[PDB]
Design goal:
Organism (chain C): Homo sapiens
Subcellular location (chain C): Cytoplasm, Cytoskeleton, Microtubule organizing center, Centrosome
Number of helices of chain A: 14
Number of domains of chain A: 3
Radius of gyration of chain D: 26 Å
Helix content of chain A: 25-40%
Largest interface: D-H, 44 and 44 residues
Oligomer: part of a larger assembly
Strand content of chain D: under 5%
Main location (chain H): cytoplasm
CATH class of the largest domain in chain A: Alpha Beta
Structural class of chain D: mainly alpha
Radius of gyration of chain A: 21 Å
Distance between the termini of chain D: 49 Å
Family (chain C): Belongs to the TUBGCP family.
Protein name (chain C): Gamma-tubulin complex component 3
Shape of chain D: flat
CATH superfamily of the largest domain in chain A: ATPase, nucleotide binding domain
Distance between the termini of chain A: 29 Å
Chains: A alpha/beta (about 375), B mainly alpha (about 120), D mainly alpha (about 160), F mainly alpha (about 260), H mainly alpha (about 60)
Number of helices of chain D: 6
Strand content of chain A: 5-15%
Chain lengths: ~375, ~120, ~45, ~160, ~60, ~260, ~60, ~60
């Protein structure tokens, strides 16, 4: 190149993504599973392989850390076994979840400087870092992950946390609710492995439609909507009518029995807390993001809701990348490539001279 | 100024309506003034003065025909303008009565005896 | 080559393909005459 | 995706026959200048303003071609504001002008004799192309006739 | 300009045709003259046709 | 070297006589406009000689440079010179002189310079011909100041010429010439006579032909518009004549009485 | 020009010359209804070498 | 839409070719898509102009 190489390692909420900044795809995708018997010093590929008598746990699930030992441990074993590189030749951009406390930022930076060992560091809010890859510094990001989902409004490179609305409904609630309805109707879901496999089936094959009612009536008069998949496991679970209406609980809390805010109302309440002069400027760049693009078709519903959200006397102008599975990755990958970003990136010496809390101060 | 936007300044002068409220009149003016912007005629503020007299005599105010003769003296007394023909010929073009024939009256050369 | 393309220029029973080959040969010999033209002034 | 759209911009505008590290370093400059700007009257009117400057320099039907094409181009407005900035920077016959012996419905205006002397400059341009070529054959060899052994030749460098 | 052969080629055809009408008509007066211009309006050359196309409009006023 | 340059002067010396002589009245009506369209290419030939002499003053022109320059004219004028000598040698007027150009316009297509000169010359020269074609086809009147058209007129509706003294006027009164077809209306030659035959026996009844079609005939090559044009007019004339025949003085009643 | 002849042998029409630079060698006086058999002999000598036999026979 | 967007791309190719822009077909389609996302044109005008100087010092 012309300068010292970059590194981006973000421990997300269902996965750890690593690699060198300057690639469209991450170099390495790992699980964020933490091993404990239901290994104990080996985490990642080995813990996911010995799963079945080993618990599945993520160190962050609500967008705030539930157990600090697990995060510090997966972070240290990320640096020691998964990559095995020299720290002084790889500055790392870390990304914590949005709406993390200031003490969490202090905890992340002490841990990144001591157990993880980096020569200069930066920790950022997630969806903002993703939007900086979308070629603008203004916009609204609806980020939907494994653990939670949240609409981050971001104007001029900065998210006000008062207008970031956290919503529980995510892929975990979708899988949990699938398990609940199949086992309530009568189906053996039994073990944690079969749980993971049926989650794989929902993630990959599922047909998601924009109209439920017409497709429901056609499937109820003559069912042919199915498409069978028989794995090396041997299980055959498919039904066409349930798989498009199972994620409808995102805008319909009464499908479980829940009383909650829906997704359109969440983004409505979020846009209410942004100023109306920047509402147009933000509305001129609406992004599609989130790992739920493993099957596209929820994204069409998402863009219909953002068209209906603001008043239509101006046409939607939507930034739709060819892939948004790696949205958080391509987010940090643009940032660590920048050379002017080294002046807003904090060193070890500034971290030592002005306390550990200056990572909350330097980070805008 | 730059001559392209300077037309739009006139178009926004007469009607105060925006340059996004109408675009055909403005297009019609970029049609008409371009290829008729640079002169293809030989200039004469002399000949135009001698018909400005003939216009103000036609309104039968002889003192004002002598008032223009002094204002024209002032115009040369300063010497801050190069093309003194054009604006007077313009204001002559927009003449109007506050209260025949012209091809037998002098007009300038259309460059049919001079070409470069 | 000058000989060859000169007899086929006034040979019009040489057909529509041969009179295209010869039309190309005209243009190549034009470029061959360009050089001697520059050399003549230098003489 | 957008991290590739500046890189594909970087490849197409780079020709070929170092320059293998430079592409990857120039997409870095592409992002480094994207966020220098972001930190710190219709669209068709600018096209009308450039067509006017065509008409002042002659070439009327060309300006009329520009405008008949932007009237159908109204059916992109964020592309033209970029297009007008690269319309000034560049890279680093017809027989019906003066003929009346064709047609049956053909104008009568008589003579012109106001640009018929600039109808002979029409021929002066053609002869001025084929005389500037013979000036660019005599110089590229007169730079060779006066030279010295192995000053531009690396064959002495062996 | 090689004795201005360029500028002398626009005449010597417009001039020639109008040297004929003033020979061909040598004393006709009345509608016998508008029969002597209406026989030049069916000449196959579009130069000469367009030139007598305006002469006939003038004389028939 | 001065022998090598003479063909372009030879292909000029045999055209200027042609342009002067065959634009006189006696040579047809199309032989006029043919020579009149070769005047545009002589203007260029004049400005060449002048511009060359103006380069000669500073000594930046010589024989070899000029020999290098005169190469496009040596071909382009040679085409028109052969055309001029061939029309002069024979009696090519009307359709025959418009057939020759239609032959040269195919004899070169693989170069497409020796096509373009002829393809322009054809549109230019056939203005008077298509103006005869603009009368016979859309009206039941034809004029032809110089009768050398493919249709030829005779007058056999007269004071002493009777309905059984001319019998049937189709192939007798209005007749078609075989060699004055310009060899691209040959495909429609029968129709070209019959269209204008139909139109005049409608002029006898009604006030005028009253045509809605009225389109200008232009030259094309390779997909002809001047065939589709003839087809539309040939439909309208027969429609009007048939409508008139079965409505007024109807042949149902006249045969029923027989 | 060969591919120009081939535009009158991918559409209706017929090249006529005595220069014979095209593989079609037409046969007069047979237009009865049997010309879907034989009206067009395939002259091999005017077939170009950038056209295969498969190319110079399907066009027939 | 697709035929109309093909036609509007073609007309957009013609008016940038007679204005003699250094760009080509592919980079036009790239720039058109970048403005179709909502990216500021004022920033793309810098990167094209600095690339088109900086790529020649390499060759």
């Amino acid at each position: 190149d012309d300068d010292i190489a970059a590194l981006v390692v973000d421990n997300g909420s269902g996965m750890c993504k690593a690699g060198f900044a300057g690639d469209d795809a991450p170099r390495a995708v790992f699980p964020s599973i933490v091993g404990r018997p239901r290994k104990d010093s080996y985490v990642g590929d080995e813990a996911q392989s010995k799963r079945g008598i080993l618990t599945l746990k993520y160190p962050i699930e609500h967008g705030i850390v539930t157990n600090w030992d697990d995060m510090e441990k997966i972070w240290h074993h990320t640096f020691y076994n998964e990559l095995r590189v020299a720290p002084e030749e790889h500055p790392v951009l870390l990304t914590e979840a949005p709406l993390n406390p200031k003490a969490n930022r202090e905890k992340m930076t002490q841990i990144m400087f001591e157990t993880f060992n980096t020569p200069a560091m930066y920790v950022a809010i997630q969806a903002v870092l993703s939007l900086y890859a979308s070629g603008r510094t203004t916009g609204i990001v609806m980020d939907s992950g494994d653990g939670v989902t949240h609409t981050v409004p971001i104007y001029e490179g900065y998210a006000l946390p008062h207008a970031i609305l956290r919503l529980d409904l995510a892929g975990r609630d979708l899988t949990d609710y699938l398990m609940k309805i199949l086992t309530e109707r009568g189906y053996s879901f039994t073990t944690t492995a079969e749980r993971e496999i049926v989650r794989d089936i929902k993630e990959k094959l599922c047909y998601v439609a924009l109209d439920f009612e017409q497709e429901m009536a056609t499937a109820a008069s003559s069912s042919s909507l199915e498409k069978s998949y028989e794995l090396p496991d041997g299980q055959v679970i498919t039904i066409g009518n349930e798989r498009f209406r199972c994620p409808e609980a995102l805008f319909q809390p009464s499908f479980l029995g829940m009383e909650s805010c829906g997704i359109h109302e969440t983004t409505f309440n979020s846009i209410m807390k942004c100023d109306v002069d920047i509402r147009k400027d933000l509305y001129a760049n609406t992004v599609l993001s989130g790992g739920t693009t493993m099957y596209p078709g929820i994204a069409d519903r998402m863009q219909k809701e953002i068209t209906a959200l603001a008043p239509s006397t101006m046409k939607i102008k939507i930034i739709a990348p060819p892939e948004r599975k790696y949205s958080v990755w391509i987010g940090g990958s643009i940032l660590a490539s920048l050379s002017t970003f080294q002046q807003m990136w904090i060193s070890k010496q500034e971290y030592d001279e002005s306390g550990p809390s200056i990572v909350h101060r330097k980070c805008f | 100024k730059s001559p392209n936007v300077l037309l739009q300044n006139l178009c926004c002068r007469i009607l105060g309506r925006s340059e996004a409220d109408v675009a055909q009149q403005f297009q019609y003016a970029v049609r008409v003034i371009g290829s008729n912007f640079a002169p293809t005629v030989e200039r004469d503020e002399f000949l135009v003065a001698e018909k400005i007299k003939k216009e103000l005599i036609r309104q039968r105010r002889e003192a004002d025909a002598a008032l223009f003769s002094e204002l024209h003296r002032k115009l040369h007394s300063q010497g801050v303008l190069k093309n003194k023909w054009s604006i007077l010929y313009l204001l002559l073009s927009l003449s109007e009565d506050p209260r025949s024939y012209a091809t037998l009256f002098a007009q300038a050369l259309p460059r049919d005896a001079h070409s470069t | 080559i000058r000989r060859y393309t000169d007899q086929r220029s006034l040979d019009r029973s040489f057909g529509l393909v041969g009179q295209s080959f010869c039309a190309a040969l005209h243009q190549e010999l034009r470029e061959y005459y360009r050089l001697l033209s520059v050399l003549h002034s230098q003489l | 995706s957008i991290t590739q759209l500046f890189d594909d911009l970087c490849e197409a505008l780079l020709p070929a026959a170092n320059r293998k590290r430079a592409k990857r370093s120039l997409k870095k400059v592409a992002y480094n200048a994207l966020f220098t700007n972001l930190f710190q009257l219709p669209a068709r009117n600018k096209i009308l303003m450039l067509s006017f400057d065509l008409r002042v320099g002659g070439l009327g039907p060309k300006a009329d071609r520009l405008e008949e094409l932007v009237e159908e181009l109204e059916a992109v407005g964020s592309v033209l504001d970029l297009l007008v900035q690269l319309a000034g920077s560049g890279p680093p016959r017809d027989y019906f002008l003066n003929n009346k012996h064709v047609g049956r419905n053909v104008p009568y205006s008589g003579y012109d004799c106001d640009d018929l002397s600039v109808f002979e400059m029409d021929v002066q341009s053609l002869i001025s192309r084929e005389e500037c070529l013979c000036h660019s054959m005599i110089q590229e060899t007169l730079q060779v006739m006066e030279a010295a052994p192995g000053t531009g030749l690396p064959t002495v460098g062996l | 300009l090689r004795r201005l052969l360029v500028w002398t080629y626009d005449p010597k055809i417009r001039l020639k045709t109008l040297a004929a009408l003033v020979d061909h008509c040598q004393g006709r007066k009345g509608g016998e003259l508008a029969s002597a211009v209406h026989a030049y309006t069916k000449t196959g050359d579009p130069y000469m046709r367009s030139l007598v196309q305006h002469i006939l409009s003038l004389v028939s006023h | 070297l001065v022998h090598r340059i003479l063909p372009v002067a030879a292909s000029y010396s045999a055209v200027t006589r042609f342009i002067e002589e065959k634009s006189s009245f006696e040579y047809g009506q199309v032989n006029h406009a043919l020579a009149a369209a070769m005047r545009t290419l002589v203007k260029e030939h004049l400005i060449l000689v002048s511009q060359l002499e103006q380069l000669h003053r500073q000594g930046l022109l010589s024989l070899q440079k000029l020999w290098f320059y005169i190469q496009p004219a040596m071909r382009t004028m040679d085409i028109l010179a052969s055309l001029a000598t061939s029309v002069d040698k024979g009696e090519c007027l009307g359709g025959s002189t418009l057939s020759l150009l239609h032959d040269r316009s195919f004899s070169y297509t693989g170069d497409s310079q020796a096509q373009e000169l002829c393809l322009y010359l054809t549109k230019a020269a056939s203005a008077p011909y298509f103006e005869v074609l603009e009368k016979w086809i859309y009206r039941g009147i034809i004029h032809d100041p110089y009768s050398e058209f493919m249709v030829e007129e005779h007058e056999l509706r007269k004071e002493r010429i009777q309905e059984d003294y001319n019998d049937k006027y189709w192939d007798q009164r209005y007749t078609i010439v075989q060699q004055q077809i310009p060899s691209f209306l040959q495909k429609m030659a029968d129709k070209i006579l019959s269209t204008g035959k139909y139109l005049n026996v409608v002029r006898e009844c009604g006030h005028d032909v009253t045509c809605p079609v009225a389109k200008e005939i232009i030259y094309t090559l390779k997909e002809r518009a001047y065939v589709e044009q003839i087809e539309k007019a040939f439909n309208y004339a027969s429609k009007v004549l048939l409508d008139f025949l079965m409505e007024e003085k109807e042949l149902v009643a006249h045969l029923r009485s027989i | 020009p060969v591919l120009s002849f081939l535009y009158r042998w991918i559409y209706d029409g017929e090249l006529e010359d005595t220069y014979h630079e095209f593989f079609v060698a037409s046969d007069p006086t047979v237009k009865t209804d049997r010309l879907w058999h034989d009206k067009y002999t395939l002259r091999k000598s005017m077939i170009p070498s950038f056209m295969t036999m498969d190319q110079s026979r399907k066009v027939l | 839409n697709l035929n109309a967007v093909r036609e509007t791309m073609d007309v957009l190719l013609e008016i940038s070719r007679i204005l003699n822009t250094g760009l080509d077909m592919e980079t036009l389609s790239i720039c058109v898509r970048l403005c179709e996302q909502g990216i500021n044109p004022e920033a793309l005008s810098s990167v094209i102009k600095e690339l088109r100087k900086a790529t020649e010092a390499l060759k």
